[PDB]
Amino acid sequence: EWKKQRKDSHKEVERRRRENINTAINVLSDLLPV
Amino acid sequence: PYTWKFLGISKQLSLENGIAKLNQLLNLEVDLDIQTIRVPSDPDGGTAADEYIRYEMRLDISNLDEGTYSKFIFLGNSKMEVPMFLCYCGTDNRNEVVLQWLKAEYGVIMWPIKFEQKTMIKLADASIVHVTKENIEQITWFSSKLYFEPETQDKNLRQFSIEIPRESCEGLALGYGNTMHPYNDAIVPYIYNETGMAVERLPLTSVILAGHTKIMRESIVTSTRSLRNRVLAVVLQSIQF
Amino acid sequence: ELRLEDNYVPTSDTLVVFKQLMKLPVTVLYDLTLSWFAKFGGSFDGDIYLLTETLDLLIEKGVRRNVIVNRILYVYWPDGLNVFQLAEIDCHLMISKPEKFKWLPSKALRGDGKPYVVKLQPAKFIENLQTDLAKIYHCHVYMFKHPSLPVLITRIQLFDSNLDKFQGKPLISRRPYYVAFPLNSPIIFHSVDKDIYARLVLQSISRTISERETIIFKPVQKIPVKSIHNIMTLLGPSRFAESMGPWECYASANFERSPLHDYKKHQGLTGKKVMVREFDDSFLNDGKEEPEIRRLRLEKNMIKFKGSANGVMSRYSSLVPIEKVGFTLKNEINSRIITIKLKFNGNDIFGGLHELCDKNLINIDKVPGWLAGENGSFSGTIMNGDFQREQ
Numbered sequence: 001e002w003k004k005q006r007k008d009s010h011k012e013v014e015r016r017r018r019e020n021i022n023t024a025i026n027v028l029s030d031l032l033p034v
Numbered sequence: 035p036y037t038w039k040f041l042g043i044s045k046q047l048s049l050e051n052g053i054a055k056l057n058q059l060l061n062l063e064v065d066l067d068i069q070t071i072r073v074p075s076d077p078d079g080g081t082a083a084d085e086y087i088r089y090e091m092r093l094d095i096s097n098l099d100e101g102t103y104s105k106f107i108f109l110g111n112s113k114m115e116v117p118m119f120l121c122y123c124g125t126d127n128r129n130e131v132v133l134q135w136l137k138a139e140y141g142v143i144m145w146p147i148k149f150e151q152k153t154m155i156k157l158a159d160a161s162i163v164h165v166t167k168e169n170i171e172q173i174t175w176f177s178s179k180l181y182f183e184p185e186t187q188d189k190n191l192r193q194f195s196i197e198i199p200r201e202s203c204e205g206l207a208l209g210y211g212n213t214m215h216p217y218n219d220a221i222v223p224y225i226y227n228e229t230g231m232a233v234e235r236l237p238l239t240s241v242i243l244a245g246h247t248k249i250m251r252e253s254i255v256t257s258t259r260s261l262r263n264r265v266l267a268v269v270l271q272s273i274q275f
Numbered sequence: 276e277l278r279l280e281d282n283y284v285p286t287s288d289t290l291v292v293f294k295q296l297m298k299l300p301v302t303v304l305y306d307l308t309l310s311w312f313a314k315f316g317g318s319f320d321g322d323i324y325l326l327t328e329t330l331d332l333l334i335e336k337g338v339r340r341n342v343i344v345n346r347i348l349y350v351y352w353p354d355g356l357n358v359f360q361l362a363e364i365d366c367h368l369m370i371s372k373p374e375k376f377k378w379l380p381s382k383a384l385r386g387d388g389k390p391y392v393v394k395l396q397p398a399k400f401i402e403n404l405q406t407d408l409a410k411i412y413h414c415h416v417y418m419f420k421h422p423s424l425p426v427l428i429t430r431i432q433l434f435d436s437n438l439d440k441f442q443g444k445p446l447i448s449r450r451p452y453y454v455a456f457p458l459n460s461p462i463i464f465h466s467v468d469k470d471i472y473a474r475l476v477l478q479s480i481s482r483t484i485s486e487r488e489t490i491i492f493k494p495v496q497k498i499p500v501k502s503i504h505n506i507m508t509l510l511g512p513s514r515f516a517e518s519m520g521p522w523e524c525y526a527s528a529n530f531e532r533s534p535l536h537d538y539k540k541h542q543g544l545t546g547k548k549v550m551v552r553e554f555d556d557s558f559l560n561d562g563k564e565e566p567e568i569r570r571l572r573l574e575k576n577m578i579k580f581k582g583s584a585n586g587v588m589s590r591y592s593s594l595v596p597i598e599k600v601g602f603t604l605k606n607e608i609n610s611r612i613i614t615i616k617l618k619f620n621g622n623d624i625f626g627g628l629h630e631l632c633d634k635n636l637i638n639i640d641k642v643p644g645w646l647a648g649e650n651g652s653f654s655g656t657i658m659n660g661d662f663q664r665e666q
Contacts, residue, residue, distance in 0.1 A: 004259070008258070008259070011257075015245045018245075019177075019200065019245070022177075022199070023199075023200065023201060026199060026201060027201070
């Protein structure tokens with residue numbers, strides 16, 4: 001049924017968001033003096 | 035959350051011939067899907083002996099949880115010396131009932147399955163890879179975390195981990211060049227060069243792809259409700275001798 | 276004004292202090308109790324000589340520790356011991372079982388960023404600290420030197436009044452706090468607690484030491500250390516600091532003897548023997564072996580993880596065992612920066628790695644120094660082949 005697929009896709013996009021935040025934090029951290 | 039457990043099958047039973055006596059034994063009717071797949075389509079993996087036959091069987095009185103959703107998977111191939119294995123998920127004990135029926139019905143003998151460290155690395159490589167509708171391979175990166183647990187005198191070194199974010203994995207894979215199995219191809223040699231550590235030899239306990247799956251000594255834990263085909267093909271190729 | 280004196284009696288649970296007392300042997304009990312009666316006397320009737328012969332006749336008859344402890348807690352000083360005795364029991368506990376306690380290092384700095392070598396006369400320090408602390412909290416301070424190390428140790432405990440109670444007028448106790456001072460070094464050692472009381476204490480030490488120029492404490496490490504011996508070895512004023520791991524022999528300094536030493540036994544004539552290294556990587560490839568070369572392979576592993584063929588301190592236990600370390604490699608490949616963060620845990624990380632090397636799971640020639648144990652006790656980031664302590 002389609003509703004579980006909707007939930008799975010929503011979960012996937014949420015995970016992508018969560019990963020993007022960490023990637024941005026890491027690349028920002030790599031530039032700092034310390 | 036979706037765990038799994040795998041068993042080996044000593045004979046290429048035709049499960050469809052016997053579905054009814056299972057149904058009356060289980061007091062319900064189970065579905066049975068049939069798929070002839072060509073999973074190792076890459077050229078170095080092969081273009082023959084790819085014709086695995088996959089069966090989806092489910093005990094779903096409902097699908098509110100893994101136990102009710104608990105679905106069996108049989109995948110076999112006639113050219114394979116031991117021809118077929120089995121997979122199932124959840125804590126439901128009806129799984130035990132169907133296993134008992136199988137062994138008593140087809141005269142078949144069954145055993146559980148284990149994984150080697152190299153088997154684990156290959157399985158993790160198989161977990162990330164996806165194929166588009168155009169029959170083209172693609173890769174999705176996850177923050178890998180190798181997790182070991184050695185035995186040493188006086189518990190000198192109990193455990194240690196090697197965490198590798200997405201960016202480092204992708205960078206190592208790109209530095210190695212265009213490849214299909216980055217964990218074996220690039221990451222482990224880099225770890226060995228930087229530390230002299232042989233990940234294959236070391237006592238690996240788990241390989242975790244964050245938010246995607248956890249690969250373990252006795253089981254697979256998966257974010258998705260199901261296992262993509264390369265996982266099952268790797269399992270079957272690992273069953274053998 | 277609010278400075279306490281030795282004759283005051285606090286309040287606490289009797290069973291806890293009883294269990295604390297049970298740890299001590301009989302002889303130290305005898306000595307402590309004789310001294311306590313000599314200084315304070317007690318409820319018991321009779322001269323100290325009468326007390327001496329009673330305690331004697333008790334011990335030659337082979338009486339158990341329980342009898343003495345019950346006597347101390349119920350007839351000699353039934354209402355409770357003084358603060359001095361409470362501090363003394365903890366002092367003896369620390370001296371007897373040092374490994375049960377944890378410490379953290381802290382570095383003293385002055386305005387220009389230079390290290391401030393703290394030199395301390397105990398009397399001025401103790402009086403100034405007591406006067407500074409008394410204005411905020413009721414404080415008892417006890418100071419002593421370690422029996423076997425060049426360190427001055429201080430115990431600070433704070434008290435407050437009163438759950439409900441009438442006019443008994445006791446002061447309830449609280450968990451203690453500890454500080455230590457090496458004789459000549461910029462470093463300070465103190466217990467691991469972040470309650471506001473510990474902050475007040477540490478701030479008071481920082482305020483009171485100065486007396487001629489401002490002083491501030493800058494932490495240098497985030498993970499505690501046990502066994503005051505070990506932290507003294509790591510960061511105290513000594514030869515081993517900045518010569519850890521493979522570099523321990525310079526701290527030992529016994530390899531070289533003074534120049535006027537005899538000729539014929541100067542080691543240069545006699546020499547020594549060593550093993551040749553191999554550089555083409557055959558490790559990953561692969562009993563068909565003989566004793567001598569294996570012996571010197573084990574010696575190679577020994578020195579790579581210990582710094583001396585004889586293995587200056589089992590064959591795996593290290594000088595100062597390390598329980599936790601976190602590293603972070605940063606390397607540039609194709610103009611792309613790559614991060615690998617290793618985390619180890621155990622009782623002796625580098626001893627375990629040494630064992631794995633002996634079992635041939637790790638290639639010795641590719642183990643870096645920071646992984647071998649140098650920069651010991653410091654987690655940090657490695658860039659450009661140079662270790663950098665984590666901030």
